[PDB]
């Protein structure tokens, strides 16, 4: 019946400003308030602010007053959140939700505030880096029966997605692609390993970084 759809992900400069949207399907805004709450990678939920589109006035959290601006348009039935003077610490997923304050008058007259519908979330990533091509290095093996491990280290690539295929996708004998790691420079570094009998075959990893249109084959010769 009800649905909230937000705008796509956004990589933004560390001095720019984002305006994330939150469009409502089915029921209109009405009195039910629109709350914006963000979550940093690995941290918990942080209430940013709320607005009541019927009246129009909003209220923000203590630390955001001045930066954040929550707006509502009834013509398109869309909530907006503007955030200025971005920085890495603002890199997070921003959710909008419908907050429904309610009361139970029986007994002590107790209140309850819940949020039934949420938006899928909008990832805002604040980094100073630009699209960079990966650098591939060969993690060679060295002297359980057999099962020697060798891999490829992709390093210093900013655009998040990257793929690694061993022998052009023909090798899948214990091939694991670890999630990349974000280093201080804002550039990602991934690893791709594979275990094989110590015994001959040719081992070549092909890295494909589609954003910057980079493709690199790399032979992992031992010592």
């Amino acid at each position: 019946q009800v649905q909230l759809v937000q705008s796509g992900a956004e990589v933004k400069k560390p001095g720019s400003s984002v305006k994330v949207s939150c469009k409502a399907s089915g029921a209109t805004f009405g009195s039910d308030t629109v709350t914006w709450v963000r979550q940093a990678p690995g941290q918990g939920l942080e209430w940013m602010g709320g607005i009541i589109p019927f009246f129009g006035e909003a209220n923000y959290a203590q630390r955001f007053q001045g930066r954040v601006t929550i707006t509502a348009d009834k013509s398109t039935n869309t909530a907006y959140m503007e955030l200025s003077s971005l920085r890495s610490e603002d890199t997070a997923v921003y959710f909008c939700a419908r907050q429904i304050n309610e009361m139970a008058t029986f007994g002590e007259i107790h209140y309850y505030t819940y949020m039934d519908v949420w938006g899928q979330g909008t990832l805002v990533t604040v980094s100073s880096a630009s699209t960079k091509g990966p650098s591939v290095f060969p993690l060679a093996p060295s002297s359980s029966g057999g099962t020697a491990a060798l891999g490829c280290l992709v390093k210093d690539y900013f655009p998040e997605p990257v793929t690694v295929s061993w022998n052009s996708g023909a090798l899948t004998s214990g091939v694991h692609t670890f999630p990349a790691v974000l280093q201080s420079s804002g550039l990602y570094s991934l690893s791709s390993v594979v275990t094989v009998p110590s015994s001959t075959q040719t081992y070549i990893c092909n890295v494909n970084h589609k954003p910057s249109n980079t493709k690199v084959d790399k032979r992992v010769e031992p010592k």
């Binding site: 690995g42 709320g50 203590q62 139970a104 819940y114 979330g121 694991h176 570094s189 690893s191 390993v193």
Partner: protein, 211 residues
């Protein structure tokens, strides 16, 4: 209610019953709202008010109140229930909303598994660019919580270390990786570089040296 607190992590077996607590100052007037969040998706309202469980949510979830404390009881404690649960309330002085720190419920679904550590030193080809990076890869460990500590000749090192949060889909046993970035001069300066992967109370160690 200027703040809400709750345990960072709790563990239970696959069939056990868990009771996550949320203790705050305004929980007397306001009922706690409980949300379940899975890693790559938005929170889901799992409980609100009293005995008001939203449609579709299983019947394992129950809410309880006792003055300044609220509690969410999950009777089944199934593998799908492994997640992060947040409690929410409304402040009385102002319209500000308070969220609990969140409790990470880990349902022990599989037997314990020891971590497999492999340490790759900086490849000679990388040293051509005047850079070096030690790669410490941990694989097949359950539960999926591990801590990495780097050392240099019996001396813990803290700078240049970037560790991956454990995660694996091939099987329930998790996997992680750690990178120690440093210059060739630093690498050839010391006689040893050790990666200590501590899982549960056990600690595996993998050492490399310039040779």
């Amino acid at each position: 209610g200027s703040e809400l607190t709750q345990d960072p992590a709790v563990s239970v077996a696959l069939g056990q019953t868990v009771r996550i607590t949320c203790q705050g100052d305004s929980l007397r007037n306001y009922y706690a709202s409980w949300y379940q969040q899975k890693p790559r998706q938005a929170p889901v309202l799992v409980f609100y008010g009293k005995n008001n469980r939203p449609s579709g949510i299983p019947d394992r979830f129950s809410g309880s109140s006792s003055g300044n404390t609220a509690s969410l009881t999950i009777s089944g404690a199934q593998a799908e229930d492994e997640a992060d649960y947040y409690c929410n309330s409304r402040d009385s002085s102002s319209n500000h909303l308070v969220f609990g720190g969140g409790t990470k419920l880990t349902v022990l679904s599989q037997p314990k598994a020891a971590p497999s550590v492999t340490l790759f030193p900086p490849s000679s080809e990388e040293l051509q660019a005047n850079k070096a990076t030690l790669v410490c890869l941990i694989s097949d460990f359950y539960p999926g919580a591990v801590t990495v500590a780097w050392k240099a000749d019996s001396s813990p090192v803290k700078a240049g270390v970037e560790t991956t949060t454990p995660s694996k889909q091939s099987n329930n046993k998790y996997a992680a990786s750690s990178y120690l970035s440093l210059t060739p001069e630093q690498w050839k300066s010391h006689r040893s570089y050790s990666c200590q992967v501590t899982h549960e109370g056990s600690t595996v160690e993998k050492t490399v040296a310039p040779t």
